Amino acid sequence: DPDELARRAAQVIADRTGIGEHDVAVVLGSGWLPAVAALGSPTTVLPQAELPGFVPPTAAGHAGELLSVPIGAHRVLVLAGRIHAYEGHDLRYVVHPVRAARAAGAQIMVLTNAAGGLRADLQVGQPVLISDHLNLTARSPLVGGEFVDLTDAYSPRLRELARQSDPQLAEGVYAGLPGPHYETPAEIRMLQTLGADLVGMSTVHETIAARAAGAEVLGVSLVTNLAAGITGEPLSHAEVLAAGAASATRMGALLADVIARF
Amino acid sequence: DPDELARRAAQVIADRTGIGEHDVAVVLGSGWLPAVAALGSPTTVLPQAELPGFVPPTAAGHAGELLSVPIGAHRVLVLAGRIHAYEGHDLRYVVHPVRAARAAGAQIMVLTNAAGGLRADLQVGQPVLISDHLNLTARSPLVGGEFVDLTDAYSPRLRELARQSDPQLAEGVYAGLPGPHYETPAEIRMLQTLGADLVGMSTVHETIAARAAGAEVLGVSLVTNLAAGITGEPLSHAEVLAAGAASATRMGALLADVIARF
Amino acid sequence: DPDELARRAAQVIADRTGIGEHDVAVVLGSGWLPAVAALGSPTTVLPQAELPGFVPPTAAGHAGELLSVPIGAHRVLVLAGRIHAYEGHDLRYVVHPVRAARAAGAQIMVLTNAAGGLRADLQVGQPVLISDHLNLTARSPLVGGEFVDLTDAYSPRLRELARQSDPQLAEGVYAGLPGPHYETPAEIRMLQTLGADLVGMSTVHETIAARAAGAEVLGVSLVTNLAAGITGEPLSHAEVLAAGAASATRMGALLADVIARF
Ligand SMILES: Nc1nc(=O)c2ncn([C@H]3C[C@H](O)[C@@H](CO)O3)c2[nH]1
Ligand SMILES: Nc1nc(=O)c2ncn([C@H]3C[C@H](O)[C@@H](CO)O3)c2[nH]1
Ligand SMILES: Nc1nc(=O)c2ncn([C@H]3C[C@H](O)[C@@H](CO)O3)c2[nH]1
């Protein structure tokens, strides 16, 4: 039961961190791992394998960590190593950290990702608030009659707060596609016609899970590349990571500043 | 085998109803349950659990009913309680009532749903004939080489007939999305660009199954809300049901009048 | 493991054909089976059931063949009988022949299909190079962190080469949908707004698999019908096959000429 394992994850967190309430959570996207040191000093580092429900039962492999990091007046659960739908596991594992985090008291999820830039003004290394998404996975992490209203899925308030920290932060619609392949240029023209400014392979489920769980969502894309076909520059995951690395100190400091304003 | 269980469901129906041919079938959408009393007097009430193939093997729970209701010169199988793709069961259970109904002689499926209104003229409580759909689930209830031509999936004739009953019935394209989450406003702008007038979480599979089974389809959406972001009014399932309730007497009477014209 | 069975398929091929490297592969689409005799003389005919990984474990049935055909200075693996996603088997079986073929040395995949024509100039019996695709299946045949850049998924060079053979070959964006149902006219207007010139039920996975495997892709659609609603002419699979048959000699000769230019 996802809610059960989430509650049980949250007991482990509170137990092992000594912290009954982590007020905020962050999921670090592709390339955002080096941003951790910029976020602050982890006080607890929890192997995700030690937390109920974080690891898909099968396809074994050394999952990442959940950090408890004091950021301003918040204990923040920071997810380092996430599961993506394209790994082929149930979405419950994709969104488990949001649910676990919510069970541990997280009222804000900061959902970060690497994204391809579609909108003309967006440039590589530029962080972009997600104002909205297009879930183009044909999936939901919610599994029977759980309506969730997705109006303001990406809290305008958290965005204003984000902008108080960085007033020039652009915002954009993010299209979540399954991946793990990147888009054809024709897909990218499609996405633009669909109203996407950003394209990625995560986030949408986590946002939906977050909202269903009663949490607010700040989405932040790091534009790591302009989306396929826009310039002709070939996309690569190693370019996405390297872009995230080159931008990671700034991204961490951005998040720390923004999260402290929450 | 879906066709087998459908044939076997149809034997149960004919046996328990005493009616060899139900000429029409109705699937009642979200909120349309109170419309039953408006449809007429059920002569037989069949627990869906007593009909082969209606209940997904696992995820147990007290399924609904299939009513045999005389409506005009028709015995009409009326599905009260339906299964939605978002329940996570195979689409065969989503569309089993259409197939069962077709096996019991249904030549017309009346597929009703609650939908969010996208088109400018559509208002809450307004019934809307489905002129067509966008199946945006990336799925089909058909499972190997079963081509079905979906040209006129929503019989223009049944629509004209529907309009003979209610000449001001608008019509619209319905986008079937998986749910169970409602759309982001950005998704709703996407859908509009895609040509949808209505958005929901059912119908498309049933229509496809219906057409594959050789049956005609009248789709009717009750607009229960304007789609996300159009007004800013938050979407809720309880608003969808309450809208369906407020509109249910009319909807039942509409369907009874329309079905008798068939 | 798809790569393992692919390598093992390739050993079988090299063993049974006596040919260590098949430089090219062709997947024949719906209706393209009669084009085989036009392609050349098969030197080996391999039941797909005798090749590791070609047949889905369950849903048994007499799969087709993989032909080794000398075409110009190439040994070409020609897939006769393919698996489509709509058969409900894992995509690994959909794309196994591309992977097997790549393991047997194929550097070019020629991916042929029947498609519905959306673009105004496209006519029935007209072959159309795929310049790009819209993967509208919400799926990928790649299964964990396998980025594949899909920029130039359909090699412009192979297209120019194709055009050296037939300078009037049009090109078009192909939208791969799951099927097996054909589109509603509203879906077809959607697809056009999305930038599709052609619509089908295959190819996109094979292209993605091909590219992931390091192979170049020539896509060729035979326009078998104008897409749903464009003319009103009802779509049928038997029309698709008959169109493919009427056009098969030409299509085979086209492919033979084009493949020899590779
Ligand atoms: N879909 C998609 N298109 C892009 O151009 C793109 N650029 C970066 N990313 C993100 C998403 C993943 O975190 C990770 C993909 O491995 O990087 C992208 N995703
Ligand atoms: N997807 C979607 N968007 C809406 O705005 C909307 N409004 C009503 N409905 C319908 C569909 C289901 O029967 C049921 C959702 O629980 O109500 C909607 N479905
Ligand atoms: N989706 C779709 N729409 C069409 O109008 C259409 N016309 C031909 N085809 C192709 C695809 C399959 O090979 C096969 C469908 O059985 O024929 C189509 N596919």
CSV table of N, CA and C and ligand atoms in Angstrom, one decimal, chain C residues 30 84 86 114-116 182-183 199-201 224-225 227 235 237 240, ligand 3:
chain,number,residue,atom,x,y,z
C,30,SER,N,2.5,-3.6,-43.1
C,30,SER,CA,1.2,-4.2,-43.4
C,30,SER,C,1.0,-4.0,-45.0
C,84,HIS,N,3.4,-6.2,-33.6
C,84,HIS,CA,3.0,-4.8,-33.3
C,84,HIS,C,2.6,-4.7,-31.8
C,86,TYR,N,0.2,-3.6,-30.5
C,86,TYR,CA,-1.2,-3.8,-30.2
C,86,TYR,C,-1.5,-5.3,-30.0
C,114,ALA,N,2.4,0.5,-43.7
C,114,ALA,CA,1.2,1.1,-44.3
C,114,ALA,C,0.8,2.2,-43.4
C,115,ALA,N,0.4,3.3,-44.0
C,115,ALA,CA,0.0,4.5,-43.3
C,115,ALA,C,-1.2,5.2,-43.9
C,116,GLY,N,-1.9,5.9,-43.1
C,116,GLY,CA,-2.9,6.8,-43.6
C,116,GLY,C,-2.3,8.1,-43.9
C,182,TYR,N,-8.3,2.2,-35.9
C,182,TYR,CA,-7.9,3.3,-36.7
C,182,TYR,C,-8.4,4.6,-36.0
C,183,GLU,N,-8.1,5.7,-36.6
C,183,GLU,CA,-8.4,6.9,-35.9
C,183,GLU,C,-9.8,7.4,-36.1
C,199,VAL,N,0.0,8.4,-40.6
C,199,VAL,CA,-0.4,7.8,-39.4
C,199,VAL,C,-0.4,6.3,-39.5
C,200,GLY,N,0.3,5.7,-38.5
C,200,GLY,CA,0.3,4.3,-38.5
C,200,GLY,C,0.3,3.7,-37.2
C,201,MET,N,0.6,2.4,-37.1
C,201,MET,CA,0.6,1.6,-35.9
C,201,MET,C,1.8,0.8,-35.6
C,224,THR,N,-1.8,3.9,-47.8
C,224,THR,CA,-2.8,2.8,-48.2
C,224,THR,C,-4.3,3.4,-48.3
C,225,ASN,N,-4.4,4.6,-47.7
C,225,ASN,CA,-5.7,5.2,-47.5
C,225,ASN,C,-5.4,6.6,-47.1
C,227,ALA,N,-6.2,9.4,-44.4
C,227,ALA,CA,-6.5,9.1,-43.0
C,227,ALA,C,-8.0,9.4,-42.7
C,235,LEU,N,-12.1,3.0,-43.4
C,235,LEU,CA,-10.9,2.4,-43.4
C,235,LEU,C,-11.1,0.9,-43.1
C,237,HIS,N,-8.5,-2.8,-42.7
C,237,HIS,CA,-7.3,-3.5,-42.8
C,237,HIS,C,-7.2,-4.3,-44.1
C,240,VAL,N,-6.2,-1.9,-46.6
C,240,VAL,CA,-4.7,-1.7,-46.4
C,240,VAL,C,-3.9,-2.8,-47.0
D,3,LIG,N1,-3.2,3.8,-37.5
D,3,LIG,C1,-3.4,3.6,-38.9
D,3,LIG,N2,-4.3,4.4,-39.5
D,3,LIG,C2,-4.5,4.3,-40.9
D,3,LIG,O1,-5.4,5.0,-41.5
D,3,LIG,C3,-3.9,3.3,-41.5
D,3,LIG,N3,-3.9,2.8,-42.8
D,3,LIG,C4,-3.1,1.8,-42.9
D,3,LIG,N4,-2.5,1.6,-41.7
D,3,LIG,C5,-1.5,0.6,-41.4
D,3,LIG,C6,-0.9,0.5,-40.1
D,3,LIG,C7,-0.8,-1.0,-39.9
D,3,LIG,O2,0.3,-1.7,-40.5
D,3,LIG,C8,-1.9,-1.6,-40.6
D,3,LIG,C9,-3.2,-1.5,-39.7
D,3,LIG,O3,-3.7,-2.8,-39.6
D,3,LIG,O4,-2.1,-0.7,-41.8
D,3,LIG,C10,-3.0,2.5,-40.8
D,3,LIG,N5,-2.8,2.7,-39.5
